[PDB]
Amino acid sequence: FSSLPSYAAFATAQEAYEQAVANGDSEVVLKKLKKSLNVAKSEFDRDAAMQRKLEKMADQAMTQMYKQARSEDKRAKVTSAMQTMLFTMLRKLDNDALNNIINNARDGCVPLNIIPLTTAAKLMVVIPDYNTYKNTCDGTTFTYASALWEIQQVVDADSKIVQLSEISMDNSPNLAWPLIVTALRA
């Protein structure tokens, strides 16, 4: 508004008009600087309204560019954003079964198939070391997804079937440890 030559001319004309009116002037001398004031006012109110429109349109265009950039960066990082959102919501759920399976997948065993909810279907997991084997398995029972799974078959990474009471602390480092314990829901 006040950063244009039009504003300087308008201010000069306004000051001259105010001085002429306050000091005292005839009709002609005042009308001269009022006709020279109205042209300046028309040129300044048009210029500042154009500047107002330009400022608003520039802000809208930068907002639109921000919207497009955010859209592209959300459409190109969606794979990571959705996973992070899912895990934040999962830890917000603080569900015992969900937390159990998430911690197991983080550290130790991951399911080899979709875990069932019926008491007839079976489950296959991948226990990679003795720590998770001892923490989860206890005798013929396998604790997983906040549920008791009855162990039915334990097979190592070399497709070698092994018994139940054979893997312990000292005998652990003699078999292919990425084993696949098959258990049935109780």
């Binding site: 907002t63 919207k67 959300k74 954003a81 959705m82 959102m85």
Partner: protein
């Protein structure tokens, strides 16, 4: 067509974690709250498009009562009397969203914009005149709908070819625009629910009913079970306006194009062709209006069956008894149209069975003391008519009935009605299910709609749709609109914050402070457009 079957799946909805967290921050989705998320983007597996296309097994070859159908047609034509229609040239055709798909195989090369740009007005006129003396079978592509719904069943829409759609536009669009330009008519297509339009619609429904009750019904598998006879009747009623622009051969060949393109065409579900047994290919240029005339036909048939399946000795009124006698005469005794009795029965229906018809969604203000006496279809005549003339069983649990008119229709266009006092008088406002608006906010179909800052006008429109919830006696319903206003304010404040972080200053002139204010949305439901 291809060497392998194409299995199209439906993706799950894109979550709106920001809006959901803001809602639960405002005390939403509490355990036991009357408002809970019921509408979701239900996902579908590979064999879902074909599974939904198999629902056309409910379309059976149905022979209609021809002496009854020929009178129901006259009554429906009397319903479609105030409108005007006829052929329009290619230059007079209005096409909204020219960037929509164009059937098969035209979708391989471009949208409808290409075929409305590649064809001059003379080319389109020549193609349309070709259909007046030839038949062009077309391939209709079955497309899985990706939208939020409360039902896990896959939704499918029919992608009709540009050749069929372009000619059906030139044949029907004059009548369709006339229908969607008329206010206070039985068909309320084109009548806005905003600016008091919902109140105007409901007041026109309550025209002169002496003992008024509100009654809405449901057509199970409407687009899938509609008999081919009733679809042909719908197309002929829509073709009743072509008395001058078309010859009898031209009208018949246009009907044949309709039947070969949108009634028994080759469907392209998956990547292979199939035969559509019948029903409404609910993607044609006249889907809403053909469904409207079908709905009016079903209502008129139900009224006729109520009148005829009534003990005329026990009909105390001497006018209704004579009306039933002349109804039987004009059905099974009179061979030509009795325009006098057609007008009389149309006036009787308007006085006692006033309807509000959209595409298979209807609200009827019917004389309750007449439907009790069988002088008007209450709900059981509708059930029987659907059973014997639509090959479906209309469950009465899908059909509401409101005996008090101060509370409007229980559900019309998925919108409930409550009588609110805006200004100094009482008006009917269409408020939707709060779960629908909450799900639309929470579940969105693009990832870019997961941050509202990107599309704030989306939540502005949702709050426009959710404003009449503010008057609802349940506080959580009003809390939905208040939550949307607060979220719009949050979105604008975060957009300004992000812009300030990207500038050294912030936007000074906003004028956007009306979006988080009830005044902008109240004006959307006040009778001043």
């Amino acid at each position: 067509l291809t060497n392998n079957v194409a299995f199209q799946t439906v993706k799950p909805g894109n979550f709106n974690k920001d809006f959901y967290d803001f809602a639960v921050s405002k005390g939403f989705f509490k355990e036991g709250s009357s408002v809970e998320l019921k509408h979701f983007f239900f996902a579908q597996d590979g064999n879902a498009a074909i599974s939904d296309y198999d629902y056309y097994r409910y379309n059976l070859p149905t022979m209609c009562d021809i002496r009854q159908l020929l009178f129901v047609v006259e009554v429906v034509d009397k319903y479609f009397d105030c409108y005007d229609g006829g052929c329009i040239n290619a230059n007079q055709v209005i096409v909204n969203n020219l960037d929509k798909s164009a059937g098969f195989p035209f979708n391989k090369w471009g949208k409808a914009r290409l075929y409305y740009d590649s064809m001059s007005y003379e080319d389109q006129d020549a193609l349309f005149a070709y259909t007046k003396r030839n038949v062009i079978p077309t391939i209709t592509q079955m497309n899985l709908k990706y939208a939020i719904s409360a039902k896990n069943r896959a939704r499918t829409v029919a992608g009709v070819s540009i050749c069929s759609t372009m000619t059906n536009r030139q044949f029907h669009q004059k009548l369709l625009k006339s229908i969607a330009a008329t206010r206070g008519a039985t068909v309320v297509i084109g009548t806005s629910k905003f600016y008091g339009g919902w109140h105007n619609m409901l007041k026109t429904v309550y025209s002169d009913v002496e003992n008024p009750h509100l009654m809405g019904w449901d057509y199970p598998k409407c687009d899938r079970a509609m008999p081919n006879m009733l679809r042909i009747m719908a197309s002929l009623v829509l073709a009743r306006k072509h008395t001058t622009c078309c010859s009898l051969s031209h009208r018949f060949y246009r009907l044949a194009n309709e039947c070969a393109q949108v009634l028994s065409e080759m469907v392209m579900c998956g990547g292979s062709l199939y035969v559509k047994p019948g029903g409404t290919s609910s993607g044609d240029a006249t889907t809403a209006y053909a469904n409207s005339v079908f709905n009016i036909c079903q209502a008129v048939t139900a009224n006729v069956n109520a009148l005829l399946s009534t003990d005329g000795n026990k009909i105390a009124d001497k006018y209704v008894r004579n009306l039933q006698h002349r109804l039987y005469e004009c059905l099974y005794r009179n061979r030509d149209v009795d325009t006098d009795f057609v007008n009389e029965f149309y006036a009787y229906l308007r006085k006692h069975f006033s309807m509000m018809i959209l595409s298979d969604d209807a609200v009827v203000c019917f004389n309750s003391t007449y439907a009790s006496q069988g002088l008007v279809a209450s709900i059981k005549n509708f059930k029987s008519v659907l059973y014997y003339q639509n090959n479906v069983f209309m469950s009465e649990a899908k059909c509401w009935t409101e005996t008090d008119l101060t509370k409007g229709p229980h559900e019309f266009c998925s919108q409930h009605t409550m009588l609110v006092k805006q200004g100094d008088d009482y008006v009917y406002l269409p408020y939707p299910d709060p779960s629908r608006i909450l799900g639309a906010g929470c579940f969105v179909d693009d990832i870019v709609k997961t941050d509202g800052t990107l599309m704030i006008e989306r939540f502005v429109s949702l709050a426009i749709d959710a404003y009449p919830l503010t008057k609802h006696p349940n506080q959580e319903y009003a809390d939905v609109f208040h939550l949307y206003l607060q979220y719009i304010r949050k979105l604008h404040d975060e957009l300004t914050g992000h812009m300030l972080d990207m500038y050294s200053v912030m936007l000074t002139n906003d004028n956007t402070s009306r979006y988080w204010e009830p005044e902008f949305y109240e004006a959307m439901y006040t009778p001043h457009t």
